[PDB]
Amino acid sequence: ISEFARAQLSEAMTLASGLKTKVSDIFSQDGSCPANTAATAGIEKDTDINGKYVAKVTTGGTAAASGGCTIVATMKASDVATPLRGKTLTLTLGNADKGSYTWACTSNADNKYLPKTCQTATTTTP
Template sequence: MKQVQKGFTLIELMIVVAIIGILAAVAIPAYQDYIARSQMSEAMTLAGGLKTNVSEVFSQDGTCPTNGNNGIATATDINGNYVSQVATGGTAAASGGCTITATMKSSGVSTGIQGKTLTLTLSNADTGSYVWTCTSDADQKFLPTSCTTASP
């Protein structure tokens, strides 16, 4: 009687290893981008939390509040796991002009967003509705979907 083959041949195992390598080559960079994007969303959350305070001061005084004034904590006190500080400021104009800028940490975050900033800018105030525009010096692929404009 012939003996029936049991197990896999070397060629079959090499093919499986090659397929896994190809999948890993595609998945790892995509996963790293996903991690950077989730870290950048912390900047959007912290900056977005100050929109009410800045809007209130602007509507009452017509000025852009700075950190440490008008009940807004100092820039370095507003931080997170990946964000080093969130600063408020800007130059007041009839249409707005106030800014909230979140700065990412320079270490302990994904390499594509180290030291990058995310800025929310108040506009459209002269027409009665406040619009916050989001810009960033980070690549678009790292930004939350609510921040669709990256600066070059």
């Protein structure tokens, strides 16, 4: 498994991680999840949040007891490892009602490119 591909999805996480404080602070202060398809109270426009491999980072989600707000980074459509083109990786706030905030990682890309922490689970059934 390519460390070049691993590293690109690594940009995404870091650019998304970059908004935890900003998103959890609005959730627990105003009760809602902020969305940035337009710039919004201290948070930049999703298409303005980017780097070498990330095209945009969008906030949103649906407010719930423990959290729910989502931070979705979208990969560029080019100059990126072919399987990752246009894919997304998603951080979700949780435990908002229990203590320290948690942020579960998920992605719609192949687990072979993700960190262990961002991978799905697959098992057999009866």
